[PDB]
Amino acid sequence: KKFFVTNHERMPFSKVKALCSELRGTVAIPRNAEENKAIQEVAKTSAFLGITDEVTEGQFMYVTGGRLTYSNWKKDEPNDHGSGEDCVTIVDNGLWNDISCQASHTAVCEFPA
Amino acid sequence: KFFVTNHERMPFSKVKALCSELRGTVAIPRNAEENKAIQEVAKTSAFLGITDEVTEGQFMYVTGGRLTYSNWKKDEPNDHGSGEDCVTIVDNGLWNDISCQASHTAVCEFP
Ligand SMILES: [Ca+2]
Ligand SMILES: [Ca+2]
Ligand SMILES: [Ca+2]
Ligand SMILES: [Ca+2]
Ligand SMILES: [Ca+2]
Ligand SMILES: [Ca+2]
Numbered sequence: 226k227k228f229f230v231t232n233h234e235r236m237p238f239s240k241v242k243a244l245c246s247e248l249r250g251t252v253a254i255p256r257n258a259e260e261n262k263a264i265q266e267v268a269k270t271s272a273f274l275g276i277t278d279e280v281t282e283g284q285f286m287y288v289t290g291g292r293l294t295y296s297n298w299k300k301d302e303p304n305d306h307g308s309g310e311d312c313v314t315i316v317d318n319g320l321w322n323d324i325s326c327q328a329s330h331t332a333v334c335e336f337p338a
Numbered sequence: 339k340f341f342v343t344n345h346e347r348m349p350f351s352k353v354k355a356l357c358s359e360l361r362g363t364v365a366i367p368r369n370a371e372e373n374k375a376i377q378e379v380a381k382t383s384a385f386l387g388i389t390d391e392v393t394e395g396q397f398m399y400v401t402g403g404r405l406t407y408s409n410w411k412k413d414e415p416n417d418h419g420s421g422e423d424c425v426t427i428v429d430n431g432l433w434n435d436i437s438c439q440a441s442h443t444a445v446c447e448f449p
Pocket of ligand 3: 306
């Protein structure tokens with residue numbers, strides 16, 4: 226029902242959103258453990274997910290709308306560490322960590338099948 | 339152009355179907371720059387949107403038109419054995435014609 230693609234480049238979240246929109250897709254969002262693994266497999270390295278709590282701190286929402294349903298946070302995450310972390314990356318083992326949206330991570334876009 | 343991959347390896351027929359589902363086309367390098375860019379995204383052998391399925395020895399883009407830029411490996415294309423009508427960019431950027439039924443990495447392009 227979804228295809229996940231990457232050009233392997235690492236960039237800040239704003240650039241990922243721009244890239245995926247230009248391809249007419251959206252930033253990858255895993256709706257379950259299966260999709261999560263798929264994203265991990267495609268990215269191979271840390272990648273941003275289309276999820277942020279930029280609107281209301283602590284309330285993670287999908288960039289396409291709606292409150293986060295499925296999640297796979299790494300232990301003790303999200304932690305809004307340091308000056309603040311409003312973006313989400315799928316790290317090693319497919320676990321999630323909230324991180325600065327200014328950090329550079331692999332762009333993965335999704336397309337509806 | 340943007341070149342994207344999901345890393346899966348499949349026969350050419352499936353690569354075409356895949357890129358069309360994404361509303362893109364199979365990757366086609368129009369120059370050395372694009373050829374290197376596809377090489378870097380695929381990181382392994384990948385199919386290019388170029389075949390001589392219509393007329394043997396006359397490679398054409400799947401989107402129409404005769405092949406302009408090429409980067410064949412020495413002694414290629416050789417339509418080896420029973421036949422080879424597809425084109426793969428290999429690990430070093432060079433090209434080899436190969437069976438369309440062989441499985442290689444899917445790389446799609448978007449304008
Ligand atoms: Ca915040
Ligand atoms: Ca936050
Ligand atoms: Ca964190
Ligand atoms: Ca032939
Ligand atoms: Ca041939
Ligand atoms: Ca050959």
